[PDB]
Amino acid sequence: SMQEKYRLVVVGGGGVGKSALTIQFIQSYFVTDYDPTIEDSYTKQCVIDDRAARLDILDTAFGAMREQYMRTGEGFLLVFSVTDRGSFEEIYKFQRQILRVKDRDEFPMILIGNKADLDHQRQVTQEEGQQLARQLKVTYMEASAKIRMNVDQAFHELVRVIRKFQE
Numbered sequence: 001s002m003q004e005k006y007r008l009v010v011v012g013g014g015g016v017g018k019s020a021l022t023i024q025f026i027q028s029y030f031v032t033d034y035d036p037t038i039e040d041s042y043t044k045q046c047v048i049d050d051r052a053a054r055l056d057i058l059d060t061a062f063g064a065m066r067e068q069y070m071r072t073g074e075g076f077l078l079v080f081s082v083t084d085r086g087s088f089e090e091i092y093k094f095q096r097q098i099l100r101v102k103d104r105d106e107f108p109m110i111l112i113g114n115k116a117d118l119d120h121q122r123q124v125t126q127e128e129g130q131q132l133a134r135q136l137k138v139t140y141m142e143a144s145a146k147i148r149m150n151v152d153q154a155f156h157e158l159v160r161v162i163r164k165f166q167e
């Protein structure tokens with residue numbers, strides 16, 4: 001104290017895996033039916049590029065309320081499910097809401113295509129995910145909360161993005 005601390009916010013539809021990713025990150029356990037309504041906060045002490053960081057993570061479940069957690073958010077995971085086209089299309093809305101709240105033309109965010117383990121149920125291709133990330137000028141990562149693919153990496157990379165914005 002003063003210590004490096006980051007308020008990270010996980011946003012997205014609609015059963016995309018916001019809770020599963022968060023709980024995998026914090027506890028290394030995969031939750032299969034986590035109450036979809038529950039919005040809660042978690043903390044993890046990490047070492048990223050050899051530098052200590054406390055990550056405070058809001059697992060979200062539009063108006064003043066959401067505007068406020070967007071206002072204080074230092075970085076955002078924009079999550080969709082690769083098996084849910086609707087959730088993919090919703091990403092546009094989230095990014096626009098965040099930039100409106102921030103009154104900025106860019107802000108630390110990463111696009112996450114979750115449920116990549118369900119390779120024969122995909123409604124969104126990896127190429128389509130990469131194209132969306134290009135349009136939004138953000139980093140894209142595919143993940144799976146179920147097999148714990150790119151879970152730590154997604155959160156670490158968001159911190160890297162925040163740090164690069166502060167360089």
Ligand SMILES: Nc1nc2c(ncn2[C@@H]2O[C@H](COP(=O)(O)OP(=O)(O)O)[C@@H](O)[C@H]2O)c(=O)[nH]1
Binds near residue numbers: 019032035036
């Ligand atoms: N197969 C698979 N299922 C997932 C994955 N992530 C979440 N789920 C499942 O999808 C459902 C919704 O996940 P959840 O984390 O509650 O979604 P949220 O509403 O965005 O918080 C649950 O049944 C989870 O087990 C994943 O990477 N792969």
Ligand SMILES: [Mg+2]
Binds near residue numbers: 019020035037038060
């Ligand atoms: Mg949830």
